[PDB]
Amino acid sequence: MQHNLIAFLSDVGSADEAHALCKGVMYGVAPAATIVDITHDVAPFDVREGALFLADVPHSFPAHTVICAYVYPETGTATHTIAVRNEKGQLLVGPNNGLLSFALDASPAVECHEVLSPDVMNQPVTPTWYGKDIVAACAAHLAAGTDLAAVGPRIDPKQIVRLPYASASIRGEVVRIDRAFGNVWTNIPTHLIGRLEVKILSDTVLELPFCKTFGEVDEGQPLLYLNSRGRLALGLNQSNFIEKWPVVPGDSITVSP
Amino acid sequence: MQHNLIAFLSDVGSADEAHALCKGVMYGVAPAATIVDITHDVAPFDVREGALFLADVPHSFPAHTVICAYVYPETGTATHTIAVRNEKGQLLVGPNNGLLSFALDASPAVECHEVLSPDVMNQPVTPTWYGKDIVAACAAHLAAGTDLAAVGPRIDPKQIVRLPYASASIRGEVVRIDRAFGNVWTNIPTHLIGRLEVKILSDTVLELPFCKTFGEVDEGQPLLYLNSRGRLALGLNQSNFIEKWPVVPGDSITVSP
Amino acid sequence: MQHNLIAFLSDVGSADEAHALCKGVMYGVAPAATIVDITHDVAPFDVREGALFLADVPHSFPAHTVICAYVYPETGTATHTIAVRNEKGQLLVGPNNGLLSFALDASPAVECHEVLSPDVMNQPVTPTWYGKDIVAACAAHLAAGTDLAAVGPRIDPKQIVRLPYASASIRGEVVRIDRAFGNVWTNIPTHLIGRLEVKILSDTVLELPFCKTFGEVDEGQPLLYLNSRGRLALGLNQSNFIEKWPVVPGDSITVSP
Ligand SMILES: Nc1ncnc2c1ncn2[C@@H]1O[C@H](CO)[C@@H](O)[C@H]1O
Ligand SMILES: Nc1ncnc2c1ncn2[C@@H]1O[C@H](CO)[C@@H](O)[C@H]1O
Ligand SMILES: Nc1ncnc2c1ncn2[C@@H]1O[C@H](CO)[C@@H](O)[C@H]1O
Numbered sequence: 166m167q168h169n170l171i172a173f174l175s176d177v178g179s180a181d182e183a184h185a186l187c188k189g190v191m192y193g194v195a196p197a198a199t200i201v202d203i204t205h206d207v208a209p210f211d212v213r214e215g216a217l218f219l220a221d222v223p224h225s226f227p228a229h230t231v232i233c234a235y236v237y238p239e240t241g242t243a244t245h246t247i248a249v250r251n252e253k254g255q256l257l258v259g260p261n262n263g264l265l266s267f268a269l270d271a272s273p274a275v276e277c278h279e280v281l282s283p284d285v286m287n288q289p290v291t292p293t294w295y296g297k298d299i300v301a302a303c304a305a306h307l308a309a310g311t312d313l314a315a316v317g318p319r320i321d322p323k324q325i326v327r328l329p330y331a332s333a334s335i336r337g338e339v340v341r342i343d344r345a346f347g348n349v350w351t352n353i354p355t356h357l358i359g360r361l362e363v364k365i366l367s368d369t370v371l372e373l374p375f376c377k378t379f380g381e382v383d384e385g386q387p388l389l390y391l392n393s394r395g396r397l398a399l400g401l402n403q404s405n406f407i408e409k410w411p412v413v414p415g416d417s418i419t420v421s422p
Numbered sequence: 423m424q425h426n427l428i429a430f431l432s433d434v435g436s437a438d439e440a441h442a443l444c445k446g447v448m449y450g451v452a453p454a455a456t457i458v459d460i461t462h463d464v465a466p467f468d469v470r471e472g473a474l475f476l477a478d479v480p481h482s483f484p485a486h487t488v489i490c491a492y493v494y495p496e497t498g499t500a501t502h503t504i505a506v507r508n509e510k511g512q513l514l515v516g517p518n519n520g521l522l523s524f525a526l527d528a529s530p531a532v533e534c535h536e537v538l539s540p541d542v543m544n545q546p547v548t549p550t551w552y553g554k555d556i557v558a559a560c561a562a563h564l565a566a567g568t569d570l571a572a573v574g575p576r577i578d579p580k581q582i583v584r585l586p587y588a589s590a591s592i593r594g595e596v597v598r599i600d601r602a603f604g605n606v607w608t609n610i611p612t613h614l615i616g617r618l619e620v621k622i623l624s625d626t627v628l629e630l631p632f633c634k635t636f637g638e639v640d641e642g643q644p645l646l647y648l649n650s651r652g653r654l655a656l657g658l659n660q661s662n663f664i665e666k667w668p669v670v671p672g673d674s675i676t677v678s679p
Numbered sequence: 680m681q682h683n684l685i686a687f688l689s690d691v692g693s694a695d696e697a698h699a700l701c702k703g704v705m706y707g708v709a710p711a712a713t714i715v716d717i718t719h720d721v722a723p724f725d726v727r728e729g730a731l732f733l734a735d736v737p738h739s740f741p742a743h744t745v746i747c748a749y750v751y752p753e754t755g756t757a758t759h760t761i762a763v764r765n766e767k768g769q770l771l772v773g774p775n776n777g778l779l780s781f782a783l784d785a786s787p788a789v790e791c792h793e794v795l796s797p798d799v800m801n802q803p804v805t806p807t808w809y810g811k812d813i814v815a816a817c818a819a820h821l822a823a824g825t826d827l828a829a830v831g832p833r834i835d836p837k838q839i840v841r842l843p844y845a846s847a848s849i850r851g852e853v854v855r856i857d858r859a860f861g862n863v864w865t866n867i868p869t870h871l872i873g874r875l876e877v878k879i880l881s882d883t884v885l886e887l888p889f890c891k892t893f894g895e896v897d898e899g900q901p902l903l904y905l906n907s908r909g910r911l912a913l914g915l916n917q918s919n920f921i922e923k924w925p926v927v928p929g930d931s932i933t934v935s936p
Binding site: 210 | 919
């Protein structure tokens with residue numbers, strides 16, 4: 166089934182031609198397709214960061230999307246590329262190394278195949294650039310309407326490598342930092358908490374108001390809020406939270422009355 | 423009226439998925455549309471910088487463009503999003519916080535509405551991301567051909583918040599720095615000045631040649647020139663001016679014989 | 680001949696609107712065209728870096744591509760813009776300052792013209808922005824199907840300025856660094872070498888395994904490999920090579936048994 170929108174993520178950066186050569190390959194295979202970057206600024210080899218960036222992609226993108234993603238330090242080894250159709254009807258192509266984990270949490274795999282057929286690859290395949298020659302190439306063939314079954318053998322969904330994700334029990338942790346603004350996102354869902362005391366940084370205790378948005382406190386002041394989808398977040402109104410309280414992903418966050 | 427080209431600016435950066443999720447929403451609503459970034463590297467919350475970046479957009483882009491822009495620290499408050507048709511026939515969508523000021527100077531507002539209708543929003547609207555759920559969503563509905571009147575109530579052009587812009591009287595000031603090259607742009611127009619003495623930095627006095635272009639002086643040497651549209655500028659031939667004379671926006675520049 | 684794909688490179692960065700204004704001009708002229716960035720992060724004025732980034736573009740992109748590239752410190756002087764049809768049938772537009780050198784090595788010029796006709800320029804042409812008003816504008820006219828002969832007078836291929844490129848004789852040198860990962864690329868071709876001793880950094884001698892890919896050594900360990908097209912490269916498995924051995928382009932690399 167034609168999937169005319171390719172959404173593209175990698176760790177190769179956008180500061181040289183690498184990411185663009187992949188687009189060249191994709192436009193060659195699927196001249197009817199639109200290519201849009203998710204980002205190419207995933208930290209090098211950081212599969213978990215890439216996985217986090219993909220989490221909300223299935224929901225925000227239409228059904229005719231191919232999610233093409235690679236953070237692939239295992240390029241040229243036995244770790245295969247996989248192609249997946251999800252419950253929304255979107256297609257996903259990436260290394261079977263955990264990268265697609267959180268995107269699949271959002272919309273589960275319905276059918277999954279290993280990408281082994283030379284006919285969906287850019288030949289000759291260079292061992293160090295499976296990202297271009299297998300992931301990007303296959304994504305474009307699928308965008309063009311190639312049968313998922315033609316990419317290679319079917320595998321069971323459990324054969325898709327998944328990254329563990331910690332759940333809040335209220336004790337949670339920092340999942341990621343929105344580096345543009347310095348806002349801190351936790352794994353604490355809306356329902357578990359429904360001024361509060363927040364414990365982090367030599368047992369830092371902050372008394373923070375729970376707000377709907379940034380502007381409900383004065384400029385530079387800290388706030389708690391529920392972020393763009395259902396998770397507790399910390400920020401400063403028009404300032405950078407991690408410049409005041411330098412927390413990293415994995416650090417514990419406890420919220421109590 | 424269909425406006426098949428969406429030009430997109432924000433302060434969310436291009437180093438994670440945020441800006442891409444907005445594009446996902448827009449492609450979902452307007453599958454016939456082309457989306458092109460202006461930039462997402464506006465300094466966080468810096469409405470004036472965003473406004474400056476938009477100034478030359480109306481002239482450079484065709485009439486069938488929707489200018490979709492958000493630098494929106496007031497997200498989730500009483501400061502509304504507005505939708506505008508300009509004199510060129512382009513559409514603009516952004517927060518009513520001054521962001522569109524200089525784009526509107528270039529091509530004035532003809533009709534303006536507040537974006538209040540849920541039917542042009544991405545539901546449910548998250549208080550902290552009006553950028554995606556109102557600005558981007560509405561821009562896409564307009565691109566798809568939604569009547570401007572359908573977005574919400576008409577307002578008078580004077581209800582559009584405008585950022586003050588200093589005029590040269592020759593005494594002017596630094597407006598912006600082209601950070602890629604370090605060239606300094608002033609507010610001094612072509613007609614007011616038509617070697618010269620330039621006073622800035624402990625009363626720095628420079629004797630500079632007025633040139634048409636960079637290569638009219640030797641490499642590394644300073645020059646005065648009229649920039650890409652009618653304003654006096656300072657640069658070094660194949661070097662970075664603000665690395666030699668570290669001026670910031672707002673600093674006074676006086677030019678005399 | 681219509682060339683519906685414009686691949687776009689410059690040194691103006693993607694952190695402000697400059698690169699986007701060029702796209703505005705191009706979309707205005709060629710509304711049927713798709714514009715994809717190669718990169719805008721070429722170091723300022725660095726023609727050689729830009730040239731290197733373009734080298735693999737002809738091969739990776741389809742025949743209906745216009746390669747639009749400018750790193751143009753000679754803007755507004757006697758150094759003209761040129762338009763070229765290559766052996767693949769692609770079109771290229773850029774300053775005649777060496778920028779297109781390595782792209783032309785990959786697919787030689789068949790026909791070349793100087794861009795002198797006002798009718799393929801964005802009028803009025805600003806002396807400091809030939810990149811937008813001549814290079815981008817002309818690229819779009821060619822994309823739209825303008826006869827190459829209409830841009831200006833024919834020149835001989837030898838009138839295209841070329842950058843010298845050092846050949847390996849095994850003694851070679853560092854050509855470029857993949858800054859995303861810190862991998863080092865040399866000019867040493869596959870055939871000249873077909874554990875090895877590598878001499879660089881106070882006569883640094885390393886004993887390195889020759890591998891097909893990164894994962895064939897333990898994490899953090901150095902390796903030799905043949906890169907994404909036929910040249911000897913140095914890297915660390917999931918680490919940054921130039922953070923351990925800080926080599927720059929031009930530095931000698933000797934490989935021996
Ligand atoms: N030095 C390296 N070590 C391990 N993987 C690398 C290295 N350089 C690039 N890669 C990987 O190559 C992949 C592309 O095939 C990238 O996604 C990247 O993770
Ligand atoms: N910590 C913050 N304080 C104020 N505004 C913010 C913050 N983080 C993000 N935003 C704003 O949210 C907007 C998107 O709705 C962005 O344009 C940005 O300016
Ligand atoms: N200060 C400068 N000196 C020389 N060239 C410049 C300068 N600033 C911008 N340019 C050149 O202008 C070109 C666009 O016409 C860019 O490719 C850039 O190389």
